[PDB]
Amino acid sequence: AKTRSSRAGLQFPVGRVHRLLRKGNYSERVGAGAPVYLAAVLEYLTAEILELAGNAARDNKKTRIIPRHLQLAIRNDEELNKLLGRVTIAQGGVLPNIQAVLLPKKT
Amino acid sequence: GGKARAKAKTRSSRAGLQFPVGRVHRLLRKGNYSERVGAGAPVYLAAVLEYLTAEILELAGNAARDNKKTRIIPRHLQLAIRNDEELNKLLGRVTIAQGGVLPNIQAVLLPKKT
Amino acid sequence: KKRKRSRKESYSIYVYKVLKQVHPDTGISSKAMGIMNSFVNDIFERIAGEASRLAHYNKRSTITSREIQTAVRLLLPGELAKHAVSEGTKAVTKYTSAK
Amino acid sequence: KKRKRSRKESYSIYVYKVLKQVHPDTGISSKAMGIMNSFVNDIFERIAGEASRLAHYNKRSTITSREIQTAVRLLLPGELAKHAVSEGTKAVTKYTSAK
Amino acid sequence: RKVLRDNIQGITKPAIRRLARRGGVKRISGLIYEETRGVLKVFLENVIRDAVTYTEHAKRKTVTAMDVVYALKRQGRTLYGFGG
Amino acid sequence: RDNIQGITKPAIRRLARRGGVKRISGLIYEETRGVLKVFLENVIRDAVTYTEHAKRKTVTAMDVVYALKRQGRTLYGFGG
Amino acid sequence: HPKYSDMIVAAIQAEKNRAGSSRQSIQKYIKSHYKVGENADSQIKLSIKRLVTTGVLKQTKGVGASGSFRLAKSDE
Ligand SMILES: [Ca+2]
Ligand SMILES: [Ca+2]
Ligand SMILES: [Ca+2]
């Protein structure tokens, strides 16, 4: 008896996902590929963010990822940003950005 | 046969409605909303759709009658809706095809009046 | 012999019915009818979805007229909400009272 | 001892597991993990929703991996979409042959 | 228990000035501060009304973080890091 | 194929009239053109994506309408 | 009125005779005090169709649709 995840080469719970699908009133019937595909995409997107967040944590000389790190990862990355366009990260802050005309004259 | 009647009325009729209480109920079961659908739900819903549909037609139909027309057309609908604070809000992110816009010229652009 | 168009539903007969209530002498262009039809479908799907989330959020299997109402207070602005609820209530009360 | 707290699910372990695959020596705060949990839940509902509608727009009773895919193409930006489509496809192709 | 005070004023000038700092604002009209409060007020009305509705529908007498979250997502202002 | 120039100055002016605009810089007609292009790309992509998923070679009104809705620009009067 | 697995009990229980029990003599007795709707014959054959397959009623002799039944299951 083995996990559908390990059968698909994944970390995310193929089984959990399949159940959430059935139980979420998206459709009457749910193909056996669906949760395998969906779980994998969720894993890919989680991983992408965790690479970046992680880097922005290393950058801060901090061993643990915190919301700021997530925010910096996401906001600094054209695509992640779009995807999370109307999303508000709690305790994330904003990217350092002072409009040009508000600085004094540089030399 | 000593009175076990077969009868045959339409749910809409009972609730006092033009909108199909049957159709609506069906669309609920079918439309991946929930496992189960109440007996009251589609009556209420149908009522609500009737209310809002009546409301607009009431207003558009006026808009036609002011234009000297007996047919309601998209403009009449677009007028009805955009000049009604509440409806406008409800249909804020909606485009009425062949509606056009409400006449509006920002004041600064109009010439100093003589 | 030709008989091939699909059979696609519409709310057009009820749009017309309700039309003959509010203004019995005036009619409606085809394009207007189809705006109306999108209109109903829009709001159906808006109300339903919220009511579907209300349920699912409150761990229930049943969309009831309680969810329709809650959705309606959520989805319509003040005065429309009021009359919509009011008309909703009335309709249901009248239907329990009939059969 | 009294009553033990009722089960609340989470993706936390699966986020952790992933985390260690990417940045082994990197860990993660309570609040951070809560954000990851929102994010996964977010994109579930997004993709599931789009797939629901795809199926329903095509008169299909079934959300298959096809729905999930098209959905992902509709919902993800370019480079993110591709890699998604790969890793999903990979992982079905593996699942299929491991029966 | 007790009906509440006139608190909207507790959204002080300092605080409003700090928030507009986070937003990259350098110089601030005098009139900004009261205008903000009105905006802030309308925001909270709009969310809380929706939240309280989710409360009221669940027949609970205590607004939950999820009520807020569901409302906020309804308002198009999706919030991560508090559930769902 | 450079049909974008088919979006003439006159047609662009007209649109902006209806937007209550009174006077128009010369640089706008190109700026408009780009914007208009980006909009269509985003709508058409999605539309065709619906087309390819129903395994058809002919884009339908519905395809458009379903895309427009995803894009938040819901459209009434073409089979909503 | 009572249910149709309430009605099917009353005919076979009360008298016990013709063709062990069979379809006409059940429907004659049943109509006298159920009070007949048009659906009587339709939901009396359906009541038999699921009562024969559950074990509440067991069949004596027949082929496909036709036959004759009893109340006490076979060997019990
Ligand atoms: Ca069902
Ligand atoms: Ca790495
Ligand atoms: Ca007959």
Cα–Cα distance measured from residue D22 to residue D33, given in angstroms and rounded to the nearest whole number? 16
Indicate the SS3 state at residue F75: strand
Partner D contacted by E38 (CB < 8 A): no
**Helix boundaries (H) for chain C:** 12-22, 30-57, 65-75, 78-96
The structure tokens listed for B113 are 């009046």
Mutate to test the interface with C, among A20, A23, A25 (most CBs of C within 10 A): A25
Cα–Cα distance measured from residue E77 to residue E71, given in angstroms and rounded to the nearest whole number? 9
Cα–Cα distance measured from residue A77 to residue A82, given in angstroms and rounded to the nearest whole number? 9
The structure tokens listed for C48 are 């339903």
Report how this structure was experimentally obtained.
Answer: X-ray
DSSP letter, residue B32: T
Question: Hey, what domains does chain B have and what are their CATH numbers?
Answer: 11-109 (1.10.20.10)
B24 Cα distance to chain centroid: 15
Residue A91 to residue E80, Cβ atoms within 8 A: no
User: B64 with B76: CB under 8 angstroms?
Assistant: yes
Per the listing, tokens 């009939």 go with C98
Beta bridge pairs of residue G69: G59
Nearest one of B90, A37, B104, A74 to D69, comparing CA atoms: A37
**Pairing, β G58-59 against β D27-28:** unpaired
Residues in chain C that come right before a backbone break, where C and next N are over 2.5 Å apart:
none
Cα–Cα distance measured from residue B96 to residue C14, given in angstroms and rounded to the nearest whole number? 20
User: A21 with D68: CB under 8 angstroms?
Assistant: no
User: C29 with B73: CB under 8 angstroms?
Assistant: yes
Cα–Cα distances in angstroms (integers) from residue A2 to residues A9, A30, E24, in the given order: 12, 21, 54
C59, amino acid identity: K
Determine the distance in angstroms separating the CA of C42 from the nearest CA of chain F, rounded to an integer. Answer: 7
List the domain range (segments joined by +) for residue G7: 1-76
Cα–Cα distance measured from residue F8 to residue F10, given in angstroms and rounded to the nearest whole number? 5
Distance D19 CA to ligand 2 centre (A): 9
Indicate the SS3 state at residue G70: strand
CA atoms within 13 A on the CB side of B109: 10
DSSP per-residue string spanning E62-75: S--HHHHHHHHHHT
- Tell me phi and psi for residue D62, to 5 degrees: -120, 130
The structure tokens listed for C85 are 């609820």
Burial (0-12, 13-18, 19+ Cβ within 10 Å), F19: exposed
Partner F contacted by C46 (CB < 8 A): no
Residue A50 to residue D79, Cβ atoms within 8 A: no
A96, amino acid identity: P
DSSP letter, residue A101: G
Nearest one of A85, E81, A59 to D32, comparing CA atoms: E81
Per the listing, tokens 């009562």 go with G51
Cα–Cα distance measured from residue B18 to residue C73, given in angstroms and rounded to the nearest whole number? 23
Mutate to test the interface with B, among C15, C35, C61 (most CBs of B within 10 A): C35
Nearest one of F79, B24, E75, F64 to C47, comparing CA atoms: B24
Nearest one of E3, E1, E32 to E16, comparing CA atoms: E32
Indicate the SS3 state at residue G66: strand
DSSP per-residue string spanning E4-73: P---GGGS-HHHHHHHHHHTT-----TTHHHHHHHHHHHHHHHHHHHHHHHHHHTT-SS--HHHHHHHHH
Nearest one of B55, B54, B76 to B64, comparing CA atoms: B76
| 3-state percent helix, strand, coil for chain G, nearest multiple of 5 | 50, 10, 40
Provide, as residue numbers in chain G, all residues whose Cβ is less than 8 Å from the Cβ of B7.
none
User: C52 with C39: CB under 8 angstroms?
Assistant: no
Cα–Cα distance measured from residue B23 to residue B26, given in angstroms and rounded to the nearest whole number? 5
Determine the distance in angstroms separating the CA of D58 from the nearest CA of chain F, rounded to an integer. Answer: 7
The structure tokens listed for F52 are 């390819």
Cα–Cα distance measured from residue E43 to residue E39, given in angstroms and rounded to the nearest whole number? 6
Nearest one of A35, A40, A13 to A24, comparing CA atoms: A35
Cα–Cα distances in angstroms (integers) from residue F22 to residues A32, B110, B112, F13, F27, in the given order: 59, 9, 15, 9, 15
- Helices A34-59 and D12-22: crossing angle, nearest 10°? 60
Provide, as residue numbers in chain E, all residues whose Cβ is less than 8 Å from the Cβ of C54.
54, 57
User: B89 with B68: CB under 8 angstroms?
Assistant: no
Partner A contacted by E76 (CB < 8 A): yes
Ligand with smallest separation from the Cα of G40? 3
The structure tokens listed for A85 are 């366009």
G25, amino acid identity: S
Cα–Cα distances in angstroms (integers) from residue D16 to residues A89, B6, C58, D38, E1, in the given order: 19, 65, 29, 15, 45
Cα–Cα distances in angstroms (integers) from residue E59 to residues D62, E15, E49, E50, E52, in the given order: 35, 36, 15, 14, 10
Q: Residues of C near A (CB-CB distance < 8 A)?
A: 52, 56
G12 Cα distance to chain centroid: 7
User: B35 with C80: CB under 8 angstroms?
Assistant: no
Beta bridge pairs of residue G25: none
Nearest one of G14, G73, G3 to G43, comparing CA atoms: G3
Q: Please, which residues have CB within 8 angstroms of residue F44's CB and are 6 or more apart in sequence?
A: F67
Burial (0-12, 13-18, 19+ Cβ within 10 Å), F24: middle
User: B58 with C23: CB under 8 angstroms?
Assistant: yes
DSSP per-residue string spanning A32-72: SSHHHHHHHHHHHHHHHHHHHHHHHHHHTT-SEE-HHHHHH
The structure tokens listed for C32 are 């207007």
Size of the A and E interface in Cβ pairs below 8 Å: 27
Cα–Cα distance measured from residue G20 to residue E23, given in angstroms and rounded to the nearest whole number? 91
Nearest one of B26, B25, B27, B18 to B41, comparing CA atoms: B25
Per the listing, tokens 């959990």 go with A16
Q: Find the CB nearest D84 among A44, A69, A89.
A: A44
Cα–Cα distance measured from residue G50 to residue E19, given in angstroms and rounded to the nearest whole number? 72
Q: Find the CB nearest B94 among F22, F74, F78.
A: F74
Burial (0-12, 13-18, 19+ Cβ within 10 Å), D74: buried
**Pairing, β A29-30 against β C62-63:** unpaired
Cα–Cα distance measured from residue B97 to residue C34, given in angstroms and rounded to the nearest whole number? 10
Determine the distance in angstroms separating the CA of C77 from the nearest CA of chain A, rounded to an integer. Answer: 23
**Cβ neighbours, 10 Å, residue G12:** 18
Nearest CA in chain F to B109: F22
User: B33 with A24: CB under 8 angstroms?
Assistant: no
Which resolution in angstroms does this entry have? Answer: 3.4
Cα–Cα distances in angstroms (integers) from residue G11 to residues A86, C73, G38, G49, in the given order: 70, 56, 19, 17
User: A5 with A12: CB under 8 angstroms?
Assistant: yes
User: C70 with E53: CB under 8 angstroms?
Assistant: yes
User: G67 with G45: CB under 8 angstroms?
Assistant: no
Distance linking the first and last C-alpha atoms of chain D = 45
Distance A67 CA to ligand 2 centre (A): 19
DSSP letter, residue B111: P
Cα–Cα distance measured from residue D1 to residue D6, given in angstroms and rounded to the nearest whole number? 14
Nearest one of C92, E58, A4, D24 to B17, comparing CA atoms: C92
Q: Please, which residues have CB within 8 angstroms of residue B54's CB and are 6 or more apart in sequence?
A: C18, C21, C22
User: D65 with D92: CB under 8 angstroms?
Assistant: yes
Distance G62 CA to ligand 3 centre (A): 29
CA atoms within 13 A on the CB side of E68: 11
Mutate to test the interface with D, among B27, B30, B32 (most CBs of D within 10 A): B32
Cα–Cα distance measured from residue B27 to residue C44, given in angstroms and rounded to the nearest whole number? 9
- Tell me phi and psi for residue E57, to 5 degrees: -70, -40
Distance linking the first and last C-alpha atoms of chain G = 30
**Pairing, β E78-80 against β A87-89:** parallel
Cα–Cα distance measured from residue A103 to residue A96, given in angstroms and rounded to the nearest whole number? 14
Cα–Cα distance measured from residue F40 to residue F57, given in angstroms and rounded to the nearest whole number? 19
Nearest one of A22, B99, B34 to C66, comparing CA atoms: B34
**Cβ neighbours, 10 Å, residue A49:** 26
Per the listing, tokens 């609730």 go with B15
Provide, as residue numbers in chain F, all residues whose Cβ is less than 8 Å from the Cβ of D57.
50, 54, 62, 66
B98 Cα distance to chain centroid: 18
Longest dimension (CA), chain D: 54
Cα–Cα distance measured from residue B42 to residue B22, given in angstroms and rounded to the nearest whole number? 7
**Cβ neighbours, 10 Å, residue B36:** 14
**Pairing, β A87-89 against β D62-63:** unpaired
User: A95 with A76: CB under 8 angstroms?
Assistant: yes
Cα–Cα distance measured from residue F38 to residue F33, given in angstroms and rounded to the nearest whole number? 9
User: A90 with A67: CB under 8 angstroms?
Assistant: yes
Cα–Cα distances in angstroms (integers) from residue D85 to residues A41, C36, F50, in the given order: 7, 39, 16
Distance linking the first and last C-alpha atoms of chain F = 33
Cα–Cα distance measured from residue D50 to residue D38, given in angstroms and rounded to the nearest whole number? 18
When divided into structural domains, chain G yields a total of 1
Cα–Cα distance measured from residue A74 to residue F4, given in angstroms and rounded to the nearest whole number? 34
**Pairing, β B36-37 against β A64-65:** unpaired
> Which is it for the CA torsion E51, E52, E58, E63, positive or negative?
positive
- Tell me phi and psi for residue G70, to 5 degrees: -135, -175
**Pairing, β G58-59 against β G69-70:** antiparallel
**Cβ neighbours, 10 Å, residue B89:** 13
Q: Find the CB nearest B96 among F18, F68, F76.
A: F76
Indicate the SS3 state at residue E80: strand
Q: Please, which residues have CB within 8 angstroms of residue F32's CB and are 6 or more apart in sequence?
A: F7, F12, F15, F16
The structure tokens listed for C50 are 């919220």
- Rounded to 5°, the CA angle D72-D77-D78 comes to 100
- Helices F28-53 and D30-57: crossing angle, nearest 10°? 70
Residue C35 to residue F76, Cβ atoms within 8 A: yes
Per the listing, tokens 């944590």 go with A57
